[PDB]
Amino acid sequence: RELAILATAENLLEDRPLADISVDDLAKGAGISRPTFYFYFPSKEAVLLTLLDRVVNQADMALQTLAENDRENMWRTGINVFFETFGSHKAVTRAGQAARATSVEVAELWSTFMQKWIAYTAAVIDAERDRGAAPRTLPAHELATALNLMNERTLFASFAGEQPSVPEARVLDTLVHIWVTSIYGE
C-alpha cells in the first residue's frame, strides 16, 4: 500500500501540481481510505519527499556504480546518470525542485546530495590533475560547484521545456562540452 500511494502520487504529478492533488486523490488511486493513507504518510508533502528521496538515491547509486567500474566519454557517462535518472522522472524532478522553496526537508535532501556530487566531481578533477591530464587552473571544488549548479539549472529547464532552455536532445552534448573544456582547458 506504501508503493501504491507512491505510484499514484507520481502518476498524478505528471498531470498537475502537488497543490491540486488531495490526500483523497492519493488514497482513491491507492485503493485505501483517507485515514489509512495517514497511517503510511503524515501529508501529501511527505509523499513527495519520499518520491524525491528515491530518485536522488537512484542517481547516487548509479554514479557510485560507475565510480567502481577517453576523458570526454568518462564525463559524458557520468553526466548521463543525471540526464537519464531525472529525465525518466520528470514530474517528481519538477515537483521536488518547487518544494525546495516550502519544505526544509526537501531543501536539506537536495543540499546534502549536491554536496556529495560536487565532492565526487572535485575528487575526479584532483585525480586528473595529479596524473598530469588536467591543468591546475581554478580550485577544483569551486569549479565542481559551478559545473554541478549549471547541470542542475540546465537539465531541469530542458526537462520542463522552460523558455529559455537547451532542447532536451542537445543538453547532454552541451554540458559535456562545457565540463571537458573547463576541466582540461588552460
Ligand X SMILES: CC(C)Cc1cn(-c2ccc(C(=O)NCCC(F)(F)F)cc2)nn1
Where along the sequence are the contacts to ligand X (CB under 6 A)? 66-67, 74-75, 77-79, 82, 86, 117, 120-121, 124, 148, 151-152, 155
- Cα dihedral value 161, 165, 170, 174, nearest 10: -150
Question: Quick one: what does residue 74 bind among a copy of itself, ligand X, none, with the CB cut-off 5 to 8 Å set by partner type?
Answer: ligand X
Q: Which residues bind a copy of itself (CB under 8 A)?
A: 98, 101, 111, 114-115, 118, 137-139, 142-143, 145-150, 152-154, 157, 162-167, 170-171, 173-175, 177-178, 180-182, 184-185
Contact 48, 18 (CB under 8 A): yes
Question: Quick one: what does residue 126 bind among ligand X, a copy of itself, none, with the CB cut-off 5 to 8 Å set by partner type?
Answer: none
* Minimum CB distance to a copy of itself, residue 157 (Å): 6
* Minimum CB distance to ligand X, residue 7 (Å): 22
Name which of 8 and 151 has its Cβ closer to ligand X.
Answer: 151
Name which of 32 and 137 has its Cβ closer to a copy of itself.
Answer: 137
Name which of 41 and 117 has its Cβ closer to ligand X.
Answer: 117
